[PDB]
Amino acid sequence: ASLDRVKVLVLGDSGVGKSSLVHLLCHNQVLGNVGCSVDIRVHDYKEGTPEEKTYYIELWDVGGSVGSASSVKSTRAVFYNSVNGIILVHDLTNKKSSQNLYRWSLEVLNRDQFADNQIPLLVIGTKLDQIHETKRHEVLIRTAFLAEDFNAEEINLDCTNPRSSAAGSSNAVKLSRFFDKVIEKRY
Amino acid sequence: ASLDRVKVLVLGDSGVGKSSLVHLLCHNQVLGTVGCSVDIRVHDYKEGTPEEKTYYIELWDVGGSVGSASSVKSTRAVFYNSVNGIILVHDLTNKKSSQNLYRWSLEVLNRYDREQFADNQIPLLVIGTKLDQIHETKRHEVLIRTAFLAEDFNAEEINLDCTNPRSSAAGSSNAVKLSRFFDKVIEKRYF
Chain B residue at shortest CA distance from A7: B5
A37–B contact, CB cutoff 8 A = yes
What is the Cα–Cα distance from A59 to B10, expressed in whole angstroms? Answer: 19
Question: Which of B8, B26, B42, B78 should one mutate to test binding to chain A, selecting the residue with the greatest count of A CBs within 10 A?
Answer: B78
Q: Chain B closest CA to A105's CA: distance in Å?
A: 19
* Partner residues linked to A44 by β-bridges: A54
Using a CB–CB cutoff of 8 Å, tell me whether B40 touches chain A. yes
For chain A, the 3-state helix, strand and coil shares in percent, each to the nearest 5, are 35, 20, 40
Answer for the pair A7, A83: CB distance below 8 angstroms, yes or no: yes
Angstrom distances, CA of residue B13 to CA of A38, A104, A133, B147: 19, 36, 50, 19
Q: Which residues pair with A38 in a beta bridge?
A: A60, B36
What is the largest distance, in Å, between two alpha-carbon atoms of chain A? 50
Contact A40 B78 (CB under 8 A): yes
From chain B, the residues in CB contact with A5 under 8 A are: 5, 7, 81-82
Q: Does residue B114 sit at the A interface (CB-CB below 8 Å)?
A: no
CA A63 to chain centre: 13
Residue B83 CB neighbours (<10 A): 17
Residues of B in contact with A81 (CB under 8 A): 3, 5, 56
Return the C-alpha torsion angle A171, A173, A174, A177, nearest 10.
Answer: 150
Among B3, B38, B56, the residue with its CB nearest the CB of A38 is B38
Provide, as residue numbers in chain A, all residues whose Cβ is less than 8 Å from the Cβ of B79.
Answer: 38, 40
C-alpha dihedral sign at B86, B92, B93, B95: positive
User: Under a CB-based contact definition with an 8 Å cutoff, are residues B61 and B19 in contact?
Assistant: yes
Please indicate if any CB of chain B lies within 8 Å of the CB of A3. yes
Q: Are B103 and B141 in contact (CB under 8 A)?
A: no
From chain A, the residues in CB contact with B41 under 8 A are none
End-to-end CA distance of chain B: 18
The three-state secondary structure class of A134 is coil
Burial of A37 (0-12, 13-18, 19+ CB in 10 A): buried
A–B interface: beta-carbon pairs under 8 A: 44
Domain boundary assignment for chain B: 1-191
Do A9 and A87 meet the contact criterion of CB atoms below 8 Å apart? yes
B5-11 β-sheet, strand order? A153-156, A121-126, A85-91, A5-11, A53-61, A37-45, B36-45, B53-61, B5-11, B85-91, B124-129, B156-159
In DSSP terms, A6 is beta-bridged to: A57
Residues of B in contact with A36 (CB under 8 A): 37-39
How many angstroms separate the CA of residue A129 from the nearest CA in chain B? Answer: 27
Method: X-ray
Q: Do B39 and A35 touch (CB under 8 A)?
A: yes
Mark which residues 69-108 of B lie under 8 Å from A by CB: 78-79, 81-82
* Beta strand A121-126 pairing with A53-61: unpaired
Q: Is B56–A39 a contact, with Cβ atoms under 8 angstroms apart? A: no
List the one residue out of B182, B137, B135, B136 whose CA is nearest residue B158: B182
Test mutation, A29, A36, A60, A81, chain B, max B CBs within 10 A: A81
Neighbour-count burial of A71, counting CB atoms closer than 10 A to its CB (0-12 exposed, 13-18 middle, 19+ buried): exposed
Residue type at position B112: Y
Q: What angle do CA B34, B37, B39 make, to 5 degrees?
A: 150
Give chain B positions within 8 Å (CB) of A78. Answer: 40, 42, 56
| Pairwise CB contact (< 8 Å): B56 & A78 | yes
CB-count exposure of residue B82 (10 Å: 0-12, 13-18, 19+): exposed
Cβ distance B38 to A37 under 8 Å? yes
- Beta-carbon separation of A56 and B81 below 8 A: yes
User: Using the beta-carbon criterion (under 8 Å), do A37 and B42 form an inter-chain contact?
Assistant: no
